[PDB]
Write a protein that binds this ligand. Sequence first.
Ligand SMILES: [Cl-]
Ligand SMILES: [Cl-]
Ligand SMILES: [Cl-]
Ligand SMILES: [Cu+2]
Ligand SMILES: [Cu+2]
Ligand SMILES: [Cu+2]
Ligand SMILES: [Cu+2]
Ligand SMILES: [Cu+2]
Ligand SMILES: [Cu+2]
Lengths: 336, 336, 336
Amino acid sequence: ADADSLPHTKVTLVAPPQVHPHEQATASGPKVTEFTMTIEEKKMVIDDSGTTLQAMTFNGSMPGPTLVVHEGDYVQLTLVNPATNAMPHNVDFHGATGALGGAKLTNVNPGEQATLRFKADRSGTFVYHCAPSGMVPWHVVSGMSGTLMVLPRDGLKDPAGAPLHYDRAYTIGEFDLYIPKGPDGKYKDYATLAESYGDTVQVMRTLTPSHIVFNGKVGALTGANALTASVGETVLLIHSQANRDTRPHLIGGHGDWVWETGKFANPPQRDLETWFIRGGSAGAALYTFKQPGVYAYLNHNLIEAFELGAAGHISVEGKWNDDLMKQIKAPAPIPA
Amino acid sequence: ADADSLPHTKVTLVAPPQVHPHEQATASGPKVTEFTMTIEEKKMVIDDSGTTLQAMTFNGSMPGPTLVVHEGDYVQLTLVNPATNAMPHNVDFHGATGALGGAKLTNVNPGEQATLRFKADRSGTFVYHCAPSGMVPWHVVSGMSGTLMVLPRDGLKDPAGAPLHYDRAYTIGEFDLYIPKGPDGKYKDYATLAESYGDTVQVMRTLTPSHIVFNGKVGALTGANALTASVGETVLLIHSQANRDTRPHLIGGHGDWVWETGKFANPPQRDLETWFIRGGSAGAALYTFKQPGVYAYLNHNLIEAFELGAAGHISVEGKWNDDLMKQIKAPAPIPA
Amino acid sequence: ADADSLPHTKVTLVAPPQVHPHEQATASGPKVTEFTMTIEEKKMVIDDSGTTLQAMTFNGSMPGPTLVVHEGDYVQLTLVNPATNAMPHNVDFHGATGALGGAKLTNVNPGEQATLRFKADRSGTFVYHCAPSGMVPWHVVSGMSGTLMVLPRDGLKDPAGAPLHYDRAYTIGEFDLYIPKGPDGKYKDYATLAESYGDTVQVMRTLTPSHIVFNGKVGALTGANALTASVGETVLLIHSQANRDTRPHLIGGHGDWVWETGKFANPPQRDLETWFIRGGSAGAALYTFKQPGVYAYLNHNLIEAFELGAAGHISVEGKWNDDLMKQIKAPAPIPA
Ligand SMILES: [Cl-]
Ligand SMILES: [Cl-]
Ligand SMILES: [Cl-]
Ligand SMILES: [Cu+2]
Ligand SMILES: [Cu+2]
Ligand SMILES: [Cu+2]
Ligand SMILES: [Cu+2]
Ligand SMILES: [Cu+2]
Ligand SMILES: [Cu+2]
């Protein structure tokens, strides 16, 4: 079980909301799984009015990509901070043990890279985020977080030990954003990342976000970018929030099996209407679709969802089942 | 199990905080349980200073009445929107599957009605609320929500499978309200429902409620309207919050058995001091009273309870038990 | 089991973050455990800029000391309100049954004392706090709360019934503070406790704390006051929040066994990254350290932790384990 003598394999990451190909149950023994990520500081448009955010990312996306391994594997990560960036970064994995999650060993300035290895000995969905000494909250709320999923080697199980299987996995990162407003009542636009600092920290101290978005912008998971599924398919919905609580709900569906604290050695709860992800954690839910149609997935503080942006769509094909729900009489004039 | 061939029965609903008569464990087979609700838009007084709210309700109350059925039954609801109302409404049941909880099939304008049927296949306490496209948060925080309780056919059980029974059930809906203040520092009073819209949405965006009330007003469950019980009685306390988290506590008592996520196929937790209802869900707790006296039931963010209004009273008759608690020496001067 | 015929023993309390000496598993039968606490109203400095708080305490500390007994014991407490204080106080134990937790029987004015006894029949960590009629939120957020820990007579157990043992226990009280700012943008300093009242209640109503501290001040658990442990030691971390939610996280570690609702008759959850303490409750977590180094323990809303103060340090001695984590390549220039 000395990692230096195990087989090494390289994985290619994919952008959210997809998750890279992987096995659930596996017959493999432990290995060293190698990953690479590159930091990207960039301005982005987060809404339909042109509001911008001076963002900081892992691999260009919010959230960063999901990494998937099995309990007992070793994660080997090369973190690259290109010289086009202006700030120093690092990475803290909540799934790792020691040295502030690895943040003490991965401090890279622009133009540097570093390589860390850690044993993934605990199963579950865990957050990873940047955490530079003295600038922690700002790097996290500007985009620097993602999920590491450590599956049990035997796959997911229900409370009685029966196997659970998913057909598709989707990853959703939810981000509370603090965009300053100027004296004319409009959101401010900054020329550089450093310029946004001072106004931004003052808005963070009110504890009131201007916007709360799934995957980088208002409406990111709607229209042509909605998630897709069919009747009879089982989906795994991974949800991460690295700084603030959230309470996910699928309108028209449920959480058939949910790990709200996200740790797969504990039994899941069933039939949930709305579950709770603690700020600084990732959780997971399974659902098998039984009816076709458009579904909304959102934070069930409804003001956060519909006024501030934390909502997305799932578009599901198949045949309608009148035994589960039926319109007995359509809307019509009250009888006189 | 085709609902068109099952026996149909009509139920008469009662106003909160009572719950309509029902069986716990039952020997009946599945049936179609028919209900009717009528929407009422009305101005109400929510506090002792005369502050009003341009409210929207189901059946005239906040919360709407609790509906009770058994797992495997079908719920058939006729929703009536009278022509005295000004807005369109609908209903989303978190306990149902498909068509946005039934909201896509129940869109009624003033002067219309519609009838929906759905299978109640999952046990637990679930929220139901209005959800009109583009106006969701406003209809919910103005009053439009209630609870649907789906009991297991065998009644409630503890973690080891032993039967649990309640003598009385009470339903509490908790509502975060966003009442705008004018330039003189006083709360505004609006002539019509539509006029309150624009100021109200601006207060919702701060995420800071002006008031947080149980059942429609500050002090609704105090004085002559306090809940009542006696020593040795077991009560079921159902608590719903359709938009914001809350953390219920019984001062002087406990939660003997609690389902905080509200889903009866999961084992309850015991001996809780304070539990947690996620915004967009209903939960339930059982308690057997052992001491007489006045008890307070409240949201244990104490500022929310005592400054903003989220607190109520339970008045309990019976005999005091000095083995559980005894005053050894009453307040007296410190000995010199 | 008549408490008047049981053996009585007096315990001497210690200041947080330590906990008074006690047994875990015990062969003793029930007893009456006697404690004394004295109230102290005092001004304190809570940060490095000189900001003061007109505070109210139990025994001079925030939080008050942790009291430890075993399930079935009786707690006998003498509460003393010295005549140097200006206000009336009392105590509500969430672990007790009846008379508003004992608050109806312990109303002491300055110059008075009173003695209460109650059966500790439910195991777990429970909050105790002051609760004077009409002034409840203010006495609690000014400092008046602590934890009562009721251990099972057989000690802590895992979900399968296996014994769990801790080598050290630490108690952390987290306090949301509402310090008013004057017209010059600086925090106000008050000559007396009564003078702070009116400005303070207005800040409480915004629901936005100015500061959120562990054990009385920003940086209380850092530097020479950091908590200490060694590799291989198992620590019990007790965390109380009497008014507002919090979400504890150990950077570089985990919660090996956690009771987030704090009630030891329920099975713990394992491998948690971040857990959740409901406002108005205390919870507990166990962790066995595997790596040496400085660890941070904090509220994982990172703005609350690093901008408002809710963070502390644990300093751990021992030998580094490269099989759990290893730096493969230190930060260096990207290869060209
Ligand atoms: Cl919804
Ligand atoms: Cl209380
Ligand atoms: Cl952290
Ligand atoms: Cu960074
Ligand atoms: Cu973290
Ligand atoms: Cu409506
Ligand atoms: Cu809903
Ligand atoms: Cu007091
Ligand atoms: Cu309390």
